Design a protein around this ligand. Structure first.
Ligand code: OGA
Ligand code: FE2
Ligand code: ZN
Ligand code: ZN
Lengths: 487, 10, 6
Protein backbone atom coordinates (compact mmCIF):
# COMPACT_ATOMS: atom_id res chain seq x y z
CA UNK A 1 0.00 0.00 0.00
CA UNK A 2 1.09 3.64 0.15
CA UNK A 3 3.84 4.65 2.58
CA UNK A 4 2.05 7.83 3.63
CA UNK A 5 -0.63 5.54 5.07
CA UNK A 6 1.86 3.85 7.39
CA UNK A 7 2.12 4.62 11.10
CA UNK A 8 3.75 6.30 12.78
CA UNK A 9 4.59 4.53 14.90
CA UNK A 10 4.66 1.55 15.33
CA UNK A 11 5.91 1.77 11.74
CA UNK A 12 3.13 -0.55 10.57
CA UNK A 13 0.14 -0.27 8.23
CA UNK A 14 -2.24 -2.09 10.55
CA UNK A 15 -2.28 -1.79 14.34
CA UNK A 16 -2.15 -5.34 15.76
CA UNK A 17 -5.64 -5.08 17.24
CA UNK A 18 -7.76 0.25 25.32
CA UNK A 19 -8.81 -0.56 21.74
CA UNK A 20 -7.16 1.47 18.99
CA UNK A 21 -10.07 0.56 16.79
CA UNK A 22 -9.04 0.99 13.18
CA UNK A 23 -8.53 4.61 14.11
CA UNK A 24 -5.89 7.14 13.09
CA UNK A 25 -4.89 10.79 13.49
CA UNK A 26 -2.74 12.99 11.24
CA UNK A 27 -0.05 15.46 12.31
CA UNK A 28 -0.87 19.00 11.20
CA UNK A 29 2.87 19.70 10.91
CA UNK A 30 4.88 16.66 9.77
CA UNK A 31 1.69 15.52 8.05
CA UNK A 32 2.26 11.83 8.89
CA UNK A 33 -0.48 9.43 10.06
CA UNK A 34 -0.44 7.80 13.50
CA UNK A 35 -2.49 5.04 15.01
CA UNK A 36 -4.51 6.63 17.80
CA UNK A 37 -2.66 4.52 20.35
CA UNK A 38 0.68 5.40 18.72
CA UNK A 39 -0.20 9.10 18.74
CA UNK A 40 0.56 9.45 22.43
CA UNK A 41 -2.93 10.88 23.03
CA UNK A 42 -5.50 9.46 25.45
CA UNK A 43 -9.06 9.02 24.21
CA UNK A 44 -10.36 12.06 26.07
CA UNK A 45 -7.98 14.14 23.96
CA UNK A 46 -9.13 13.08 20.52
CA UNK A 47 -11.54 15.95 20.07
CA UNK A 48 -9.71 18.67 22.00
CA UNK A 49 -7.09 19.85 19.56
CA UNK A 50 -7.52 22.00 16.49
CA UNK A 51 -3.76 21.53 16.01
CA UNK A 52 -1.65 18.40 16.54
CA UNK A 53 1.47 18.25 16.68
CA UNK A 54 2.98 14.78 17.15
CA UNK A 55 5.94 13.75 19.37
CA UNK A 56 8.43 14.26 16.51
CA UNK A 57 7.28 17.89 16.27
CA UNK A 58 6.44 19.29 19.73
CA UNK A 59 9.91 20.31 20.98
CA UNK A 60 9.97 22.58 17.91
CA UNK A 61 6.25 23.17 17.23
CA UNK A 62 4.91 23.63 20.76
CA UNK A 63 2.32 21.61 22.63
CA UNK A 64 -0.84 20.85 20.64
CA UNK A 65 -3.17 23.81 20.19
CA UNK A 66 -6.62 23.04 21.54
CA UNK A 67 -9.85 24.48 20.17
CA UNK A 68 -11.15 27.80 21.42
CA UNK A 69 -14.04 27.65 23.90
CA UNK A 70 -16.38 29.29 21.42
CA UNK A 71 -19.71 28.13 22.94
CA UNK A 72 -19.56 27.12 26.66
CA UNK A 73 -23.31 26.39 26.76
CA UNK A 74 -23.05 23.66 24.13
CA UNK A 75 -21.50 20.21 24.42
CA UNK A 76 -19.59 21.07 21.29
CA UNK A 77 -18.17 24.19 22.97
CA UNK A 78 -15.44 24.26 20.31
CA UNK A 79 -17.96 24.68 17.51
CA UNK A 80 -18.78 28.16 16.15
CA UNK A 81 -21.83 26.95 14.22
CA UNK A 82 -23.45 26.33 17.57
CA UNK A 83 -22.89 29.72 19.24
CA UNK A 84 -26.54 30.66 18.59
CA UNK A 85 -28.19 27.45 19.82
CA UNK A 86 -29.77 27.04 23.24
CA UNK A 87 -28.14 26.29 26.60
CA UNK A 88 -27.69 22.54 27.11
CA UNK A 89 -28.01 20.56 30.35
CA UNK A 90 -25.41 20.51 31.88
CA UNK A 91 -22.85 22.40 29.82
CA UNK A 92 -20.33 24.71 31.47
CA UNK A 93 -22.78 27.61 31.15
CA UNK A 94 -25.74 25.60 32.44
CA UNK A 95 -23.98 24.10 35.48
CA UNK A 96 -22.45 27.49 36.30
CA UNK A 97 -25.95 28.97 36.64
CA UNK A 98 -27.47 25.83 38.15
CA UNK A 99 -24.98 25.85 41.02
CA UNK A 100 -26.64 29.11 42.16
CA UNK A 101 -30.35 28.25 41.71
CA UNK A 102 -30.12 24.54 42.50
CA UNK A 103 -30.80 25.04 46.20
CA UNK A 104 -34.47 25.83 45.45
CA UNK A 105 -35.47 22.22 44.76
CA UNK A 106 -37.57 20.86 47.64
CA UNK A 107 -36.44 18.44 50.32
CA UNK A 108 -37.88 14.89 50.22
CA UNK A 109 -40.72 13.57 52.36
CA UNK A 110 -40.24 10.98 55.10
CA UNK A 111 -42.04 8.56 52.78
CA UNK A 112 -39.29 9.01 50.17
CA UNK A 113 -36.09 9.23 52.21
CA UNK A 114 -35.39 8.22 55.77
CA UNK A 115 -32.32 9.78 57.35
CA UNK A 116 -30.83 7.75 60.18
CA UNK A 117 -27.84 8.39 62.45
CA UNK A 118 -26.03 5.09 61.92
CA UNK A 119 -26.08 1.49 60.70
CA UNK A 120 -27.90 0.27 63.79
CA UNK A 121 -30.79 2.71 63.44
CA UNK A 122 -30.98 1.84 59.77
CA UNK A 123 -31.53 -1.82 60.56
CA UNK A 124 -34.50 -1.03 62.83
CA UNK A 125 -36.26 1.25 60.38
CA UNK A 126 -35.40 -1.15 57.57
CA UNK A 127 -37.01 -4.15 59.29
CA UNK A 128 -39.97 -2.00 60.33
CA UNK A 129 -40.74 -1.54 56.65
CA UNK A 130 -40.40 -5.23 55.76
CA UNK A 131 -36.65 -5.40 55.19
CA UNK A 132 -35.34 -6.00 51.67
CA UNK A 133 -38.39 -7.92 50.39
CA UNK A 134 -40.35 -4.71 50.75
CA UNK A 135 -37.63 -2.13 50.11
CA UNK A 136 -39.02 0.99 48.43
CA UNK A 137 -37.59 4.15 50.03
CA UNK A 138 -34.03 5.45 49.98
CA UNK A 139 -31.99 5.65 53.19
CA UNK A 140 -29.25 8.06 54.15
CA UNK A 141 -26.96 6.93 56.95
CA UNK A 142 -25.04 9.75 58.62
CA UNK A 143 -22.58 7.33 60.22
CA UNK A 144 -21.39 3.97 58.88
CA UNK A 145 -21.03 2.38 62.33
CA UNK A 146 -23.34 -0.65 62.34
CA UNK A 147 -23.52 -1.21 58.58
CA UNK A 148 -20.68 -3.77 58.59
CA UNK A 149 -19.39 -2.07 55.49
CA UNK A 150 -15.65 -2.14 55.07
CA UNK A 151 -14.22 1.24 54.09
CA UNK A 152 -10.65 2.57 54.07
CA UNK A 153 -9.40 5.03 56.69
CA UNK A 154 -9.99 8.73 55.88
CA UNK A 155 -6.82 10.45 54.80
CA UNK A 156 -7.05 7.65 52.27
CA UNK A 157 -7.50 9.39 48.94
CA UNK A 158 -6.94 9.52 45.20
CA UNK A 159 -3.18 8.93 45.55
CA UNK A 160 -3.49 5.56 47.29
CA UNK A 161 -5.93 4.57 44.57
CA UNK A 162 -3.67 5.29 41.59
CA UNK A 163 -0.87 3.60 43.49
CA UNK A 164 -2.83 0.42 44.24
CA UNK A 165 -4.41 0.19 40.78
CA UNK A 166 -1.42 1.55 38.88
CA UNK A 167 -0.97 4.86 37.03
CA UNK A 168 -1.45 3.36 33.58
CA UNK A 169 -4.78 1.87 34.69
CA UNK A 170 -7.39 3.33 32.34
CA UNK A 171 -10.91 4.25 33.38
CA UNK A 172 -14.06 5.49 31.62
CA UNK A 173 -14.20 9.13 32.63
CA UNK A 174 -16.97 11.64 32.10
CA UNK A 175 -15.99 14.79 30.25
CA UNK A 176 -18.59 16.86 32.08
CA UNK A 177 -19.06 19.98 29.92
CA UNK A 178 -19.12 17.66 26.95
CA UNK A 179 -21.55 15.23 28.63
CA UNK A 180 -19.56 12.33 27.13
CA UNK A 181 -17.33 9.45 28.20
CA UNK A 182 -13.71 8.69 27.26
CA UNK A 183 -10.89 6.61 28.71
CA UNK A 184 -8.35 8.37 30.90
CA UNK A 185 -5.21 7.13 32.64
CA UNK A 186 -5.62 7.09 36.39
CA UNK A 187 -2.34 9.07 36.56
CA UNK A 188 -3.53 11.62 33.98
CA UNK A 189 -6.71 12.07 36.00
CA UNK A 190 -4.70 12.59 39.15
CA UNK A 191 -2.73 15.36 37.48
CA UNK A 192 -5.79 17.26 36.32
CA UNK A 193 -7.45 16.68 39.65
CA UNK A 194 -4.53 17.94 41.67
CA UNK A 195 -4.53 21.13 39.62
CA UNK A 196 -7.36 22.89 41.40
CA UNK A 197 -6.74 26.30 39.78
CA UNK A 198 -6.62 25.36 36.09
CA UNK A 199 -9.55 23.18 35.03
CA UNK A 200 -10.46 24.26 31.49
CA UNK A 201 -12.58 21.07 31.54
CA UNK A 202 -14.10 19.06 34.37
CA UNK A 203 -13.86 15.31 34.80
CA UNK A 204 -15.70 12.83 36.95
CA UNK A 205 -15.30 9.07 36.77
CA UNK A 206 -17.85 6.72 38.23
CA UNK A 207 -16.72 3.44 36.79
CA UNK A 208 -13.51 2.31 38.42
CA UNK A 209 -14.61 -1.19 39.33
CA UNK A 210 -11.94 -2.92 41.42
CA UNK A 211 -13.56 -6.21 42.49
CA UNK A 212 -10.74 -7.92 40.57
CA UNK A 213 -7.82 -6.07 42.26
CA UNK A 214 -6.52 -8.20 45.10
CA UNK A 215 -5.62 -5.19 47.23
CA UNK A 216 -8.59 -2.81 46.57
CA UNK A 217 -11.36 -5.41 46.84
CA UNK A 218 -10.24 -5.89 50.44
CA UNK A 219 -10.26 -2.21 51.35
CA UNK A 220 -13.83 -1.25 50.38
CA UNK A 221 -16.83 -3.60 50.57
CA UNK A 222 -20.64 -3.55 50.41
CA UNK A 223 -22.56 -3.63 53.69
CA UNK A 224 -23.13 -7.13 55.04
CA UNK A 225 -26.83 -6.85 54.13
CA UNK A 226 -26.05 -5.98 50.51
CA UNK A 227 -23.86 -9.07 50.20
CA UNK A 228 -26.54 -11.24 51.79
CA UNK A 229 -29.15 -10.35 49.15
CA UNK A 230 -26.90 -9.76 46.13
CA UNK A 231 -27.92 -12.12 43.32
CA UNK A 232 -24.46 -11.84 41.72
CA UNK A 233 -22.82 -12.80 44.99
CA UNK A 234 -25.16 -15.78 45.34
CA UNK A 235 -24.16 -17.11 41.91
CA UNK A 236 -20.46 -16.32 42.13
CA UNK A 237 -19.79 -16.99 45.85
CA UNK A 238 -16.31 -16.11 47.13
CA UNK A 239 -15.51 -19.65 48.19
CA UNK A 240 -12.39 -21.82 48.44
CA UNK A 241 -10.95 -25.22 49.18
CA UNK A 242 -13.58 -27.91 49.56
CA UNK A 243 -16.52 -25.49 49.27
CA UNK A 244 -15.26 -24.46 45.87
CA UNK A 245 -14.63 -28.07 44.80
CA UNK A 246 -18.25 -28.88 45.76
CA UNK A 247 -19.40 -25.86 43.76
CA UNK A 248 -17.56 -27.42 40.81
CA UNK A 249 -18.99 -30.88 41.52
CA UNK A 250 -22.53 -29.49 41.34
CA UNK A 251 -22.56 -27.89 37.90
CA UNK A 252 -22.93 -24.62 39.82
CA UNK A 253 -19.68 -23.12 38.56
CA UNK A 254 -19.82 -19.93 36.51
CA UNK A 255 -16.80 -18.31 34.82
CA UNK A 256 -15.39 -15.18 36.43
CA UNK A 257 -15.40 -13.46 33.03
CA UNK A 258 -19.17 -13.91 32.84
CA UNK A 259 -19.73 -12.34 36.26
CA UNK A 260 -21.36 -8.90 36.21
CA UNK A 261 -18.62 -6.75 37.69
CA UNK A 262 -20.49 -3.87 39.26
CA UNK A 263 -20.65 -4.37 43.03
CA UNK A 264 -17.42 -2.47 43.81
CA UNK A 265 -16.81 0.94 42.30
CA UNK A 266 -14.64 3.89 43.11
CA UNK A 267 -15.75 7.35 42.01
CA UNK A 268 -13.94 10.66 41.91
CA UNK A 269 -15.19 14.02 40.65
CA UNK A 270 -13.98 17.60 40.26
CA UNK A 271 -15.96 20.41 41.85
CA UNK A 272 -18.63 21.52 39.40
CA UNK A 273 -19.35 17.98 38.12
CA UNK A 274 -22.89 17.16 37.16
CA UNK A 275 -24.35 13.80 36.22
CA UNK A 276 -27.73 14.10 34.47
CA UNK A 277 -30.84 12.15 35.47
CA UNK A 278 -30.84 8.41 34.92
CA UNK A 279 -31.93 5.16 36.43
CA UNK A 280 -29.10 2.83 37.43
CA UNK A 281 -28.51 0.02 34.99
CA UNK A 282 -30.70 -3.07 35.25
CA UNK A 283 -32.77 -1.18 37.80
CA UNK A 284 -30.05 -2.05 40.27
CA UNK A 285 -29.95 -0.88 43.88
CA UNK A 286 -27.08 1.32 45.00
CA UNK A 287 -24.81 1.64 48.00
CA UNK A 288 -22.86 4.89 47.92
CA UNK A 289 -20.38 6.17 50.50
CA UNK A 290 -18.56 9.53 50.61
CA UNK A 291 -14.93 9.16 51.59
CA UNK A 292 -14.21 12.77 50.69
CA UNK A 293 -16.22 15.76 49.55
CA UNK A 294 -19.95 16.17 49.12
CA UNK A 295 -22.71 15.26 46.67
CA UNK A 296 -26.14 16.73 45.99
CA UNK A 297 -28.61 14.16 44.71
CA UNK A 298 -31.76 15.22 42.88
CA UNK A 299 -34.16 12.31 43.05
CA UNK A 300 -37.57 11.05 41.91
CA UNK A 301 -39.72 8.12 43.00
CA UNK A 302 -40.08 5.05 40.76
CA UNK A 303 -43.77 5.77 39.87
CA UNK A 304 -45.38 5.25 36.48
CA UNK A 305 -46.07 8.97 36.19
CA UNK A 306 -42.40 9.64 36.81
CA UNK A 307 -41.21 6.83 34.54
CA UNK A 308 -43.41 8.07 31.70
CA UNK A 309 -42.00 11.57 32.19
CA UNK A 310 -38.48 10.15 32.29
CA UNK A 311 -38.92 7.96 29.25
CA UNK A 312 -40.19 10.88 27.19
CA UNK A 313 -37.38 13.10 28.47
CA UNK A 314 -34.87 10.41 27.55
CA UNK A 315 -36.24 9.92 24.01
CA UNK A 316 -36.93 13.53 23.06
CA UNK A 317 -34.14 15.27 21.10
CA UNK A 318 -34.51 18.32 23.34
CA UNK A 319 -31.37 18.90 25.33
CA UNK A 320 -32.13 22.26 26.92
CA UNK A 321 -34.74 21.23 29.47
CA UNK A 322 -33.84 20.02 32.95
CA UNK A 323 -35.92 16.94 33.72
CA UNK A 324 -36.74 18.58 37.04
CA UNK A 325 -38.74 21.30 35.26
CA UNK A 326 -41.11 18.78 33.61
CA UNK A 327 -41.40 16.42 36.55
CA UNK A 328 -44.33 18.20 38.19
CA UNK A 329 -42.45 18.67 41.46
CA UNK A 330 -41.29 15.02 41.66
CA UNK A 331 -37.61 15.96 41.97
CA UNK A 332 -36.29 16.42 45.52
CA UNK A 333 -32.91 17.54 46.92
CA UNK A 334 -30.75 15.53 49.30
CA UNK A 335 -27.26 16.60 50.36
CA UNK A 336 -24.77 13.88 51.27
CA UNK A 337 -21.72 14.98 53.25
CA UNK A 338 -18.37 13.34 53.87
CA UNK A 339 -18.76 10.08 55.79
CA UNK A 340 -22.43 9.65 54.99
CA UNK A 341 -23.89 6.72 53.07
CA UNK A 342 -26.79 6.67 50.65
CA UNK A 343 -28.75 3.45 49.92
CA UNK A 344 -31.07 3.60 46.90
CA UNK A 345 -33.47 0.77 45.98
CA UNK A 346 -34.59 -0.13 42.44
CA UNK A 347 -36.20 2.49 40.21
CA UNK A 348 -35.22 5.84 41.69
CA UNK A 349 -34.47 8.38 38.98
CA UNK A 350 -31.59 10.63 40.03
CA UNK A 351 -29.10 13.29 39.03
CA UNK A 352 -26.14 14.49 41.06
CA UNK A 353 -24.09 17.65 41.46
CA UNK A 354 -20.62 17.66 43.04
CA UNK A 355 -20.21 20.87 45.06
CA UNK A 356 -16.69 19.83 46.13
CA UNK A 357 -13.78 17.70 44.92
CA UNK A 358 -14.83 14.19 45.87
CA UNK A 359 -14.01 10.53 46.34
CA UNK A 360 -16.64 7.84 46.75
CA UNK A 361 -17.04 4.08 47.05
CA UNK A 362 -20.23 2.48 45.83
CA UNK A 363 -21.71 -0.45 43.95
CA UNK A 364 -24.73 -1.79 42.12
CA UNK A 365 -26.70 -4.94 42.97
CA UNK A 366 -29.76 -7.01 42.05
CA UNK A 367 -31.87 -8.73 44.70
CA UNK A 368 -35.14 -10.73 44.73
CA UNK A 369 -36.83 -8.13 46.95
CA UNK A 370 -36.82 -5.72 44.02
CA UNK A 371 -37.28 -8.22 41.22
CA UNK A 372 -40.42 -6.57 39.80
CA UNK A 373 -39.06 -3.04 39.83
CA UNK A 374 -35.86 -4.46 38.30
CA UNK A 375 -37.83 -5.93 35.37
CA UNK A 376 -39.83 -2.66 35.12
CA UNK A 377 -36.58 -0.71 34.67
CA UNK A 378 -35.37 -3.29 32.15
CA UNK A 379 -38.56 -2.61 30.14
CA UNK A 380 -37.91 1.10 30.49
CA UNK A 381 -34.33 0.68 29.17
CA UNK A 382 -35.39 -1.48 26.24
CA UNK A 383 -38.12 0.95 25.24
CA UNK A 384 -35.61 3.83 25.23
CA UNK A 385 -33.04 1.71 23.35
CA UNK A 386 -35.63 1.37 20.58
CA UNK A 387 -35.53 5.10 19.90
CA UNK A 388 -31.94 5.96 20.75
CA UNK A 389 -28.64 4.25 20.01
CA UNK A 390 -26.42 3.51 23.02
CA UNK A 391 -23.51 1.26 23.97
CA UNK A 392 -24.13 -1.94 25.90
CA UNK A 393 -21.52 -0.91 28.48
CA UNK A 394 -23.95 1.66 29.92
CA UNK A 395 -26.34 -1.22 30.60
CA UNK A 396 -26.26 -4.04 33.14
CA UNK A 397 -23.59 -6.59 32.03
CA UNK A 398 -25.11 -10.00 31.25
CA UNK A 399 -28.49 -9.13 32.74
CA UNK A 400 -30.34 -12.02 31.12
CA UNK A 401 -27.59 -14.61 31.55
CA UNK A 402 -27.63 -13.80 35.26
CA UNK A 403 -31.32 -14.55 35.43
CA UNK A 404 -30.90 -17.75 33.40
CA UNK A 405 -28.33 -18.99 35.92
CA UNK A 406 -30.25 -17.82 38.99
CA UNK A 407 -33.27 -19.87 37.90
CA UNK A 408 -31.20 -22.89 36.89
CA UNK A 409 -28.92 -22.89 39.94
CA UNK A 410 -30.99 -21.47 42.78
CA UNK A 411 -34.70 -21.40 42.19
CA UNK A 412 -35.16 -24.48 40.04
CA UNK A 413 -33.70 -26.39 42.98
CA UNK A 414 -36.01 -25.14 45.72
CA UNK A 415 -39.18 -25.64 43.70
CA UNK A 416 -38.28 -29.21 42.82
CA UNK A 417 -37.56 -29.99 46.48
CA UNK A 418 -41.00 -28.84 47.63
CA UNK A 419 -42.60 -30.70 44.70
CA UNK A 420 -40.88 -33.93 45.82
CA UNK A 421 -41.61 -33.32 49.50
CA UNK A 422 -44.96 -31.91 50.60
CA UNK A 423 -45.17 -29.17 49.83
CA UNK A 424 -46.99 -25.86 49.32
CA UNK A 425 -44.31 -23.18 49.06
CA UNK A 426 -46.42 -20.36 50.51
CA UNK A 427 -45.53 -21.71 53.99
CA UNK A 428 -41.88 -20.77 54.55
CA UNK A 429 -40.91 -20.12 50.94
CA UNK A 430 -43.56 -17.74 49.58
CA UNK A 431 -41.09 -15.04 48.60
CA UNK A 432 -39.23 -17.69 46.59
CA UNK A 433 -42.39 -18.84 44.89
CA UNK A 434 -43.44 -15.34 43.75
CA UNK A 435 -39.91 -14.53 42.59
CA UNK A 436 -40.07 -17.63 40.37
CA UNK A 437 -43.42 -16.70 38.83
CA UNK A 438 -42.14 -13.22 38.04
CA UNK A 439 -38.78 -14.42 36.72
CA UNK A 440 -40.41 -17.03 34.48
CA UNK A 441 -42.94 -14.65 32.98
CA UNK A 442 -40.17 -12.24 31.96
CA UNK A 443 -37.96 -15.14 30.80
CA UNK A 444 -40.76 -16.54 28.65
CA UNK A 445 -40.82 -13.13 26.97
CA UNK A 446 -37.09 -13.31 26.25
CA UNK A 447 -37.44 -16.86 24.97
CA UNK A 448 -40.31 -15.69 22.85
CA UNK A 449 -38.34 -12.76 21.47
CA UNK A 450 -35.25 -14.90 20.88
CA UNK A 451 -37.47 -17.35 19.00
CA UNK A 452 -39.52 -14.81 17.03
CA UNK A 453 -36.35 -13.32 15.58
CA UNK A 454 -33.05 -14.99 16.44
CA UNK A 455 -30.38 -15.07 19.19
CA UNK A 456 -27.87 -12.26 19.85
CA UNK A 457 -24.27 -12.46 18.63
CA UNK A 458 -22.29 -15.66 19.18
CA UNK A 459 -22.48 -17.11 22.72
CA UNK A 460 -23.01 -17.09 25.60
CA UNK A 461 -26.04 -19.30 26.18
CA UNK A 462 -27.32 -21.47 23.31
CA UNK A 463 -31.04 -21.30 22.53
CA UNK A 464 -31.54 -25.01 23.20
CA UNK A 465 -30.04 -24.66 26.66
CA UNK A 466 -32.40 -21.82 27.49
CA UNK A 467 -35.29 -24.00 26.36
CA UNK A 468 -34.08 -26.98 28.36
CA UNK A 469 -33.95 -24.69 31.40
CA UNK A 470 -37.42 -23.43 30.50
CA UNK A 471 -38.78 -26.95 29.91
CA UNK A 472 -37.61 -27.85 33.38
CA UNK A 473 -39.07 -24.62 34.84
CA UNK A 474 -42.55 -24.93 33.31
CA UNK A 475 -42.84 -28.52 34.58
CA UNK A 476 -42.02 -27.79 38.21
CA UNK A 477 -44.09 -24.63 38.28
CA UNK A 478 -46.97 -26.44 36.54
CA UNK A 479 -46.48 -29.20 39.11
CA UNK A 480 -46.34 -26.83 42.09
CA UNK A 481 -49.58 -25.06 41.20
CA UNK A 482 -51.28 -28.46 41.58
CA UNK A 483 -50.01 -28.87 45.14
CA UNK A 484 -51.70 -25.50 45.74
CA UNK A 485 -55.12 -26.98 44.99
CA UNK A 486 -55.06 -29.16 48.09
CA UNK A 487 -53.27 -27.48 51.03
CA UNK B 1 -25.45 11.85 25.47
CA UNK B 2 -23.40 8.94 26.90
CA UNK B 3 -22.37 10.11 30.37
CA UNK B 4 -23.45 7.43 32.80
CA UNK B 5 -22.04 4.55 34.89
CA UNK B 6 -19.99 2.39 32.47
CA UNK B 7 -19.36 -1.32 33.00
CA UNK B 8 -18.39 -3.57 30.01
CA UNK B 9 -19.91 -7.05 30.05
CA UNK B 10 -17.11 -7.72 30.38
CA UNK C 1 -7.83 17.66 14.55
CA UNK C 2 -8.15 15.56 11.39
CA UNK C 3 -8.93 11.93 12.24
CA UNK C 4 -9.76 8.73 10.38
CA UNK C 5 -11.31 5.29 10.75
CA UNK C 6 -10.75 2.09 8.75
O1 OGA D 1 -21.46 10.71 41.49
C1 OGA D 1 -22.04 11.02 40.49
O2 OGA D 1 -21.58 12.10 39.72
C2 OGA D 1 -23.11 10.11 39.90
N1 OGA D 1 -23.27 8.81 40.52
C3 OGA D 1 -24.56 8.14 40.51
O3 OGA D 1 -25.49 8.66 39.99
C4 OGA D 1 -24.73 6.82 41.29
O4 OGA D 1 -23.74 6.35 41.78
O5 OGA D 1 -25.95 6.11 41.33
FE1 FE2 E 1 -26.66 6.60 39.49
ZN1 ZN F 1 0.94 2.59 14.94
ZN1 ZN G 1 4.62 15.55 13.39
Amino acid sequence: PKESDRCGGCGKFTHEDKKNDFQWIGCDSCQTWYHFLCSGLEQFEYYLYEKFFCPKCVPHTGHSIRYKVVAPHRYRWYSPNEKHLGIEVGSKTWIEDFITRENTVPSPTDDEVCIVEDGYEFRREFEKLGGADNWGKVFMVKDMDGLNMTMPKPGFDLEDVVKIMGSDYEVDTIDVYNQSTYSMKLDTFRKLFRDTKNRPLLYNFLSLEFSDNNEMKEIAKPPRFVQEISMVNRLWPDVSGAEYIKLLQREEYLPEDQRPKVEQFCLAGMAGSYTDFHVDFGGSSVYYHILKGEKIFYIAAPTEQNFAAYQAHETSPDTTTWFGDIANGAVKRVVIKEGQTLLIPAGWIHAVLTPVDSLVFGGNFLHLGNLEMQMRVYHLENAIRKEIRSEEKFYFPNFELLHWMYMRNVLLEKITEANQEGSDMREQEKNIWTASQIMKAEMERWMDRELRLGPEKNAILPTDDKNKIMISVRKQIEIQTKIQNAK
Amino acid sequence: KAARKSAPAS
